[PDB]
């Protein structure tokens, strides 16, 4: 019993974090092989007025860099720019580089943040990509370069390099190809993120997990078909329900099918009571996450 937003064990990523320092800027970077990935605003003169990145890259001097893994300092061979990242060649190879891939995450997918400061991991926690391409995290100054990852059968998929905090407090990264999530700019401009909508397949996984935990006051008697729900969904801040097979196991263990949850989702969208600790509907648990905390295989 119990439901906790969890992270995967961080060990295979901890040894990849380095400190990247240029001038008076200092942030984190990701050291894979003989190259270090880090956000490009480390080379701006100021980060409170709009930055011209093509200028900053032209007047850049490698000797101005300071990159370190612990108290071992690495030397900078070359530096190229890709999207919002810098790719920094270094004269030292990371013997601890894990088997890795890059992946861009879609909304509703869960991953892990290794929150780093001054080149060292400080915390690990799981997040979920929202529809507005933001995440609800805990990052302060110095946190940029903090990677998001998933571990898959022994491969580390890197999907996120932290970049900025919007005026709302929501957090934005790029993927490891350099492309910002959601087309946001790495500028200190007033940016307002779009409406967020709940990834309803995760909301179902969460309601099932609540029914297993023995929470059942919210269940409803009526039932609505998937297609009817989908045309209500898009006007009430929820995504459409596409794949129903994912839940094929939860119903068995609960005796309540999706159609019963869909009709229940329409009621809660509510009245002072709680579900598994939550006061409104959350979309931050994937089905594969709930499967593990309820069963394990």
């Amino acid at each position: 019993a119990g439901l906790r937003k969890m992270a995967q064990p961080s060990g295979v990523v901890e040894k990849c974090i380095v400190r990247v320092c240029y001038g008076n800027m200092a942030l984190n970077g990701l050291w894979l092989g003989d190259t270090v990935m880090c956000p490009r605003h480390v080379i701006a003169s100021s980060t409170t007025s709009t930055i011209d990145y093509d200028y900053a890259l032209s007047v850049l001097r490698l000797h101005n860099f300071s990159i370190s893994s612990g108290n071992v300092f690495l030397g900078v061979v070359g530096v190229t720019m890709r999207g919002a990242l810098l790719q920094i060649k270094v004269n030292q190879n990371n013997v601890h580089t894990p088997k890795y891939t890059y992946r861009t995450v879609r909304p509703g997918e869960s991953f892990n943040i290794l929150a780093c400061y001054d080149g060292a991991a400080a915390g690990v926690y799981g997040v979920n990509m929202r529809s507005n391409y933001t995440i609800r995290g805990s990052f302060i100054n110095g946190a940029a370069g903090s990677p998001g990852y998933n571990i898959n059968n022994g491969t580390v998929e890197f999907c996120y390099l932290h970049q900025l905090e919007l005026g709302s407090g929501c957090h934005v990264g790029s993927d490891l190809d350099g492309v910002m999530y959601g087309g946001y700019e790495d500028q200190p401009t007033l940016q307002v993120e779009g409406a967020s909508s709940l990834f309803t397949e995760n909301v179902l996984a969460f309601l099932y997990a609540a029914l297993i935990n023995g929470s059942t006051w919210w269940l409803s008697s009526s039932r609505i078909a998937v297609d009817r729900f989908n045309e209500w969904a898009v006007h009430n801040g929820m995504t459409t329900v596409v794949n129903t097979d994912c839940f094929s196991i939860f119903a068995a263990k609960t005796g309540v099918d999706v159609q019963r949850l869909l009709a229940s989702i329409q009621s809660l969208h509510n009245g002072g009571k709680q579900i598994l600790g939550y006061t409104s509907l959350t979309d931050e648990f994937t089905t594969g996450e709930v499967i593990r905390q309820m069963y394990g295989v």
């Binding site: 942030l27 605003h41 701006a44 980060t47 409170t48 990052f139 302060i140 100054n141 110095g142 946190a143 940029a144 932290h162 970049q163 900025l164 905090e165 919007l166 005026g167 709302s168 946001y184 700019e185 790495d186 500028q187 200190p188 401009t189 007033l190 940016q191």
Partner: peptide
């Protein structure tokens, strides 16, 4: 509020 590069 302006966005904060971190």
């Amino acid at each position: 509020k302006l966005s904060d590069l971190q």
